[PDB]
């Protein structure tokens, strides 16, 4: 009898995975694709906070999907005050996020707030951008 009372014993594809907004009405809006943008006049401090964010999210099991970088700004001394010249540059980097709740929303912002270092800026938003 081919099949058996042990049929389906090895099925490796419903277990594994295969191959906007977050709607969720009433509880409502369970923040979806948000790009938190880490920007600094430094390089190492900006990277070390994306370091801190990404490890924070996986600790809190809320999903991250990108960690890429916006490329670098090319500005001198802006010659608005013998006219001065020295190139100070800015290093921006993207951290994405996919899963958030309403009830973790204001809290998970605080751990980003309280731990945010010297001279860096965040900016949460939705998604319409490319490199």
């Amino acid at each position: 009898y081919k099949t058996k009372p042990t049929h389906g014993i090895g099925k490796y594809k419903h277990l594994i995975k295969a191959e906007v907004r977050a709607i969720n009405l009433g509880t409502d809006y369970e923040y979806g694709v948000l790009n938190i943008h880490l920007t600094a006049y430094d390089m190492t401090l900006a990277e070390s906070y994306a370091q801190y964010v990404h490890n924070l999210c996986n600790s809190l099991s809320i999903k991250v999907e990108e960690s890429y970088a916006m490329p670098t700004k090319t500005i001198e001394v802006l010659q608005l005050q013998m006219l001065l010249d020295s190139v100070l540059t800015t290093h921006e980097r993207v951290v994405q996020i996919s899963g958030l709740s309403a009830t973790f929303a204001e809290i998970f912002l605080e751990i980003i707030q309280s731990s945010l270092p010297e001279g860096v800026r965040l900016s949460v938003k939705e998604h319409t951008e490319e490199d």
């Binding site: 042990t6 014993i9 090895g10 490796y12 277990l15 594994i16 995975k17």
Partner: protein, 111 residues
């Protein structure tokens, strides 16, 4: 018009040749296959076209054992590392319980 042409291949005659509980001498081909359906178990070899043969003269049994692939098998180590943590794979295997003890000590002289 019949644009379709070519499907005149004959049947491969691939399947279990020695079913479960059979006595199998060492070297008999238990099964022939493509696209693994039975993996080798104890005292069962594998040839180039994935057939299964018996390595010892015994009795063939079929079990359901736990599948851990080789860590160089790069097409299926990523098969593991997308499973959730309760998961094991459970492929099926073909064993040969050997019948004959491999020899006995015998008197040859009195010296």
């Amino acid at each position: 018009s019949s644009k379709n042409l070519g499907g005149k291949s004959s049947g491969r005659r691939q399947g279990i040749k020695k079913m479960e509980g059979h006595y199998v001498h060492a070297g008999n081909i238990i099964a022939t296959q493509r696209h693994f359906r039975w993996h080798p178990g104890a005292h069962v070899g594998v040839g180039k076209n994935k057939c299964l043969y018996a390595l010892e003269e015994g009795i063939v049994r079929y079990t359901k054992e736990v599948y851990v692939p080789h860590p160089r098998n790069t097409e299926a180590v990523d098969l593991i590392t997308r499973l959730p943590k309760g998961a094991v794979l459970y492929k099926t295997f073909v064993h040969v319980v050997p019948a004959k003890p491999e020899g006995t000590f015998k008197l040859v002289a009195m010296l």
